[PDB]
């Protein structure tokens, strides 16, 4: 796999420097180090494909090496130079097209698409140049085993999850006791609803709380904490839990009192936030925890007296909110964000190339169903697809 | 089950999956007990 | 046959002994013996295959020798050794799945598969490294006929009968006499019934007998004899003899005294037991002579007496059990086992393969009606096919 | 790893050869091989435990190498060949006593316990003598990733699942229709059982199907399959779904007409067998479909008419059952047997060490809750502690 | 007796290896080990036999060493090998038999078989190749006294007991409690068993205990513990503790609830398991104790709760089983087994030649009588025969 970075951080680097009229100060140790290839790979017969829908291409390399004769590059250099790199180029995109769509239980840190295999051979290790980008970075360590970690801006950590609990119930649902909750990619959205305002409750105050596991561990988050759920402060038609019957849901937003917001670590707690909101932080957590009130105001005018009335009609309910986004963070392992093209670029290619269903992605790589047991061999899998995908993406977006 | 332990030719196999009665019959005279076990069972099955 | 064993005896230690960072020292004899393998295969075109869905495969065999200059080995040969091992393994296996097929009622030991006829030449006999298996060193003796033996862990001798026999019988089945017995794998379990109690019977006594009939002769077989029968021990609705009617058994289980176990041999007796219970032997023995009795007790408690009355009725029947496992034994001959999988990769090779019915093995090879009959014919192709199950599995597991 | 059984082996193999008498013509490579391990090894300081109660210990080896002039061995060598043996055996003791214990989700194939990672270094590898046994050789080719095989003797690969379904029930439980299920370890009895003994099913005639789901593929397994299950075939007292009553089950065997057992693999059909019982085969399989029926006898004797009348009663419940046993089998991947013992190893030092729970092996190591999720980290982990726990048996057993 | 396992090996790894055609390099050593057994044999004159059946046949030794100008082997040099190895072959048969057929009380470890006496001269002792197996490795473990062990498979360590234990009895036997067991071979079947239904004892709770002492310890061992024992669940005739009258047991088979298996050691508690069935594990004991309980249904449908009455008729036993079978196991003493052939030659031996009855050695070597009575001087013995058993096994099986 760090040949196969290499080949392509060479092969970006020459289309990129090799150009008429630059000057080979710039450029020698690049031609140095693709003659090397060149030398490493002349011999060398490669197949590609045969799942699904992708071509069985067989690649042939001689080529001739770069001459080292003149300072500044002319168009008779660029151009065997371009003749032989989009050659280049077309083979790593097939091999990484290859490698994007092999599954295995059994060692999936281990190369597939079996040319990979022969490129992971001592042989061909004369190709290294620098494995400088994160992915790759990271693959190094895990191989020589260290503190790894990925920046995410955004990460789709939570799987979508929109669902209430109903402490207190009752067949015509008039009187109800719960919480609300949605959980999508980096945001929380929670909301608790008391129908009756805490009228009947302990000096007036309806505790709420809510607990989010995480499946992978994050370390200095940065999150933005605002009150006021909006998705769950307008009127709603709710089924039942049995999916029988339906039931109205007319909120009116009060404020969170006693707000606590915990970030804790198997259990054990690490950050604790009372009464703040907007920017936080979190500097290691596994798991969150929410938890809110519902006081009902004392000191009412008649415009909301009218709303809260000591019996059980209750034509408005009485709502408490909470935002919650993880804007920035990092994890020791590969997840998905809103600023990097690795997962659309493995899915893409899947339904391209119309590969079928294997033992370790669920069908069509949902993302929901992926991080809902994030098992390791499945951690192993999409960290190798992501690399190599990081790879296809450093030549061809 | 047939085509494995009683192992089976082209045309038999052919004939068998177009339900030809004439293979079926020679089957049921060599006396191939996963054959007569299946027509007992459609005899069981027939009874009302 | 005994070239075949031995390519994949020197195949395997191949595998294991050859393994980088060795000492040459430890394998200089071994790879003398490969090089002469491949000196005596080099220059022979072999095929393979013929017979139902087996593929027609062609082998030639031109290879480069193994270095003898070395001390200690390194990858750079370990690689090359094997990438010659696995031709020879795929060609083995592909040998001994043409082999195991094929039949013959005439010199069944005499080989098939013709590249195994041309592996039987005088000029592939350099290759015999050595021949210490079981199978292959029983093989060789009884080709220079000795007294032979090969040993079993719980073996299956025993066709399956599930069966009864009544002695006394009417059409209503009221009141029976009768001896059941399940006989499988290595287990009989044998029950004698009588619904009366043996009231009428002299001294309140009745006897029952079951002789089994083995085969092919045991010898130093470990027995674990006990009473009280489970299978036939529970309520039952047993169809007659001729399919008109059906009876039912509701048994009562009493012990078997004056018990006897007779191990026989041509007739003749070898061994004899007499209320002794647990674990036996037997020395050798082609028959099983089980003698229990059904003993009415003399003195009764109230509710015991009102089940065995002195009238017709009898709706409690009387029986006396006993199980028989036999749990190791050694035979001259080749059987089945519940430790060994030759057998397993015979019938699977043949179902996956689809191999047309011979003369010889029953169709599909159902252990049942291939030891209800054990012709000499029929002993020699299972030995073969044995044999070089063991040898494929000695490298393809 | 390959150099920890490498020194388990010469030294298992210096005990036994090197004793007084013995002729060193047969003991030459041993001791070259016995004379580079000490040289491979003097100079390297390693240290051992630090989890649970083992103590940490420090090994540092400076020992003098073995005479080769002699003809004969003596005493005053064989001494001095066991008081550098022992060291070497306690080091490999306490070696694999440390990395049994220790655990890890990624890459659980990577060595804990550091000291092996330094004998995983490249300056050890010098010490390979013989890969021979199937552990250790099925370990090298996962590693040259091949098609393996661990050959196994009744295996524990079902959990026990003692459950029934009942597809016809009342809260009085005097009419019920369902299949009851006992599955452990090697065995599987099913019992399908009608209280009304088809008597308004359609053609007299009710079916029962039992669909099991092992967790890892077979192959050549070796079967048993008999009828009339025995421990769903007495009177009993069997609680309800929800635990809340009971109720009682009074059976009446009967014969299984109809069956069928079909062997799959991945919902796809591999192997079947019809109205065949005893000894069968099952090539490859993930899924056993059981599949039986209950056919009411048209004809019926007064004593069986008394059990099975028209009307609610049915103080007699009409039973089918099916026994089924897995002799032998093949598999990829590493299990519990009847015949090894490393298992028992393992659980043997962590429960008398005082290993605390670890990430990915429930509490004591109980094979049921292990092999419900049989995930690829915990068969890393377990083919890792069972190839090491072979290793020091090979030693101290 | 090492000197016997030398030859008994070198004579089997001679008619292995000294084949048609194979290559001296492989044999070379093996063929100074059998010149040099020769050249230390030849000069003596050996007698064997005079107890019972067995012919007082003398041995002496003329014979002439393997020829070494060769390359590879032919017939001419096998058939020599082979009407020399035949001699030795049988000699060391007749002197395995010899010391099966022999005991002592003081030093039983010691030679008898006097020609065996002679073999352990000071001048036989250079034939010692290599002491391998596991019988002889703690043959010379033992004698050079360290911590041993065999690895058995269901090995038969429990003596056939069936019998039973009231707790409360009445002459008419018809309110009942207690236990009942059958112990045998590697299996215990328990069964505890009340008629009442735990209706007058405290909390609708009865308690029992079985209290299994083994006369050997083990360790290592793995076990499969089921409820629902199947040999006493099913309507039984059973006879008084004082043989005169008998009584009628009539089961309905529960659950046991707080069911605990606690495998001890002198007294100190090693292992428990509470609620925990199928595979377990015991890394040591000498000792096992099964305690389990009858609880009363409290929730009862009709066709139960018309089986427990309150009063004293009581015509359905509650029943309480426990099945523990012992599949692998590890013993620093020998013991018999359903895997291996020791025990069975041994007895053949002295069942062929009619050896009387020792001091030592019960009647026939009844295995019950033989574990229930394992004095050190039986198990010296024992050792003793089983090793030269196994040798001889070794040769002719």
Same mark, same amino acid.
């Given at each position: 796999?760090?040949?196969?970075?290499?080949?392509?951080?060479?092969?970006?680097?020459?289309?990129?420097?090799?150009?008429?009229?630059?000057?080979?100060?710039?450029?020698?140790?690049?031609?140095?180090?693709?003659?090397?290839?060149?030398?490493?790979?002349?011999?060398?017969?490669?197949?590609?494909?045969?799942?699904?829908?992708?071509?069985?291409?067989?690649?042939?390399?001689?080529?001739?090496?770069?001459?080292?004769?003149?300072?500044?590059?002319?168009?008779?250099?660029?151009?065997?130079?371009?003749?032989?790199?989009?050659?280049?180029?077309?083979?790593?995109?097939?091999?990484?097209?290859?490698?994007?769509?092999?599954?295995?239980?059994?060692?999936?840190?281990?190369?597939?698409?079996?040319?990979?295999?022969?490129?992971?051979?001592?042989?061909?290790?004369?190709?290294?140049?620098?494995?400088?980008?994160?992915?790759?970075?990271?693959?190094?360590?895990?191989?020589?085993?260290?503190?790894?970690?990925?920046?995410?801006?955004?990460?789709?950590?939570?799987?979508?999850?929109?669902?209430?609990?109903?402490?207190?119930?009752?067949?015509?649902?008039?009187?109800?006791?719960?919480?609300?909750?949605?959980?999508?990619?980096?945001?929380?959205?929670?909301?608790?609803?008391?129908?009756?305002?805490?009228?009947?409750?302990?000096?007036?105050?309806?505790?709420?709380?809510?607990?989010?596991?995480?499946?992978?561990?994050?370390?200095?988050?940065?999150?933005?904490?605002?009150?006021?759920?909006?998705?769950?402060?307008?009127? !709603?038609?709710?089924?039942?839990?049995?999916?029988?019957?339906?039931?109205?849901?007319?909120?009116?937003?009060?404020?969170?009192?006693?707000?606590?917001?915990?970030?804790?670590?198997?259990?054990?707690?690490?950050?604790?936030?009372?009464?703040?909101?907007?920017?936080?932080?979190?500097?290691?957590?596994?798991?969150? !925890?929410?938890?809110?009130?519902?006081? !009902?105001?004392?000191?009412?005018?008649?415009?909301?007296?009218?709303?809260?009335?000591?019996?059980?009609?209750?034509?408005?309910?009485?709502?408490?909110?909470?935002?919650?986004?993880?804007?920035?963070?990092?994890?020791?392992?590969?997840?998905?964000?809103?600023?990097?093209?690795?997962?659309?670029?493995?899915?893409?290619?899947?339904?391209?190339?119309?590969?079928?269903?294997?033992?370790?992605?669920?069908?069509?790589?949902?993302?929901?169903?992926?991080?809902?047991?994030?098992?390791?061999? !499945?951690?192993?899998?999409?960290?190798?697809?992501?690399?190599?995908?990081?790879?296809?993406?450093?030549?061809?977006? | 089950?047939? &085509?494995?332990?009683?192992?089976?030719?082209?045309?038999?196999?052919? &004939?068998?999956?177009?339900?030809?009665?004439?293979?079926?019959?020679?089957?049921?005279?060599?006396? &191939?007990?996963?054959?007569? &076990?299946?027509?007992?069972?459609?005899?069981?099955?027939?009874?009302?």
């Amino acid at each position: 796999m760090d040949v196969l970075y290499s080949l392509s951080k060479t092969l970006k680097d020459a289309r990129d420097k090799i150009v008429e009229g630059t000057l080979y100060s710039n450029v020698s140790d690049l031609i140095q180090q693709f003659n090397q290839m060149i030398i490493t790979m002349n011999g060398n017969e490669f197949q590609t494909g045969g799942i699904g829908n992708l071509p069985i291409r067989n690649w042939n390399f001689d080529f001739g090496l770069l001459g080292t004769t003149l300072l500044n590059l002319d168009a008779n250099y660029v151009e065997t130079a371009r003749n032989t790199i989009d050659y280049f180029v077309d083979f790593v995109d097939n091999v990484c097209m290859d490698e994007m769509v092999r599954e295995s239980q059994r060692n999936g840190i281990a190369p597939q698409s079996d040319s990979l295999r022969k490129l992971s051979g001592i042989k061909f290790k004369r190709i290294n140049f620098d494995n400088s980008s994160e992915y790759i970075e990271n693959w190094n360590l895990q191989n020589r085993r260290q503190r790894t970690g990925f920046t995410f801006h955004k990460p789709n950590i939570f799987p979508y999850s929109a669902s209430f609990t109903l402490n207190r119930s009752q067949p015509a649902h008039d009187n109800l006791m719960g919480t609300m909750w949605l959980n999508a990619g980096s945001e929380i959205q929670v909301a608790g609803f008391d129908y009756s305002c805490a009228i009947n409750a302990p000096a007036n105050i309806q505790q709420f709380e809510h607990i989010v596991q995480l499946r992978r561990v994050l370390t200095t988050a940065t999150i933005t904490l605002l009150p006021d759920a909006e998705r769950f402060s307008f009127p !709603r038609v709710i089924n039942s839990a049995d999916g029988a019957t339906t039931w109205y849901f007319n909120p009116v937003i009060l404020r969170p009192n006693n707000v606590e917001v915990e970030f804790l670590l198997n259990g054990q707690i690490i950050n604790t936030y009372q009464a703040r909101f907007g920017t936080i932080i979190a500097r290691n957590f596994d798991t969150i !925890r929410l938890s809110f009130q519902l006081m !009902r105001p004392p000191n009412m005018t008649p415009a909301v007296a009218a709303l809260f009335p000591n019996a059980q009609p209750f034509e408005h309910h009485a709502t408490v909110g909470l935002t919650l986004r993880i804007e920035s963070a990092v994890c020791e392992s590969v997840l998905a964000d809103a600023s990097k093209t690795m997962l659309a670029n493995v899915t893409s290619v899947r339904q391209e190339y119309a590969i079928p269903v294997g033992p370790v992605f669920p069908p069509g790589m949902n993302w929901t169903d992926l991080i809902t047991n994030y098992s390791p061999s !499945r951690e192993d899998n999409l960290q190798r697809v992501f690399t190599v995908a990081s790879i296809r993406s450093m030549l061809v977006k | 089950n047939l &085509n494995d332990n009683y192992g089976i030719s082209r045309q038999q196999a052919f &004939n068998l999956l177009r339900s030809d009665p004439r293979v079926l019959r020679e089957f049921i005279n060599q006396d &191939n007990p996963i054959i007569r &076990n299946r027509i007992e069972q459609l005899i069981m099955q027939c009874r009302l």
